[PDB]
């Protein structure tokens with residue numbers, strides 16, 4: 001089972017969309033169709049500028065504000081019981097940008113409770129809102145021991161206009177030292 005994905009292949013290292021959401025994340029190469037209007041990446045993080053590498057993104061043209069898209073990792077087996085990390089890169093460029101949330105879902109926990117307002121703070125690894133500029137940022141999140149198998153859930157929320165494309169790339173789970181390193185140089189909480 002792969003613990004990292006650069007999204008270069010169409011099978012996405014076993015990541016799959018949520019069976020009940022508003023729309024799918026898309027895999028794409030370079031520029032988003034709405035790019036000319038100051039939104040979305042111009043290239044992925046793996047191969048960078050001039051590069052032709054692939055990222056995942058929400059197409060926000062023709063969707064409604066606060067509609068959500070979810071991308072789910074394969075199911076992992078207590079690889080969090082170490083010093084577990086989730087590390088990923090994201091691109092949030094666009095006026096009227098929506099939001100990006102990253103949850104850790106224990107397998108037993110149904111997606112309904114996971115997302116509910118009542119209980120989602122216990123599971124949020126990452127939450128960001130608004131325009132962040134034309135640039136790839138990164139995040140590293142400590143992962144809690146839930147004594148269960150689990151999934152990583154990346155949820156994009158469309159903003160108030162079609163200029164709210166969000167992209168992810170280069171996702172990763174790591175353990176131990178690699179975590180303390182990551183925390184030394186990745187933005188974290």
Ligand SMILES: *[C@@H]1O[C@H](CO)[C@@H](O)[C@H](O)[C@H]1NC(C)=O
Pocket residue numbers: 065066
């Ligand atoms: C959309 O969600 C954000 C935060 O959850 C909230 O501030 C905003 O008012 C919501 N707008 C609508 C129209 O649902």
Ligand SMILES: *[C@@H]1O[C@H](CO)[C@@H](O)[C@H](O)[C@H]1NC(C)=O
Pocket residue numbers: 174175176177178
């Ligand atoms: C940290 O990363 C290196 C290179 O990928 C690898 O050799 C090492 O096994 C990793 N450490 C742990 C504790 O997984």
Ligand SMILES: [Ca+2]
Pocket residue numbers: 006007008044045046047053054055169170
């Ligand atoms: Ca990539």
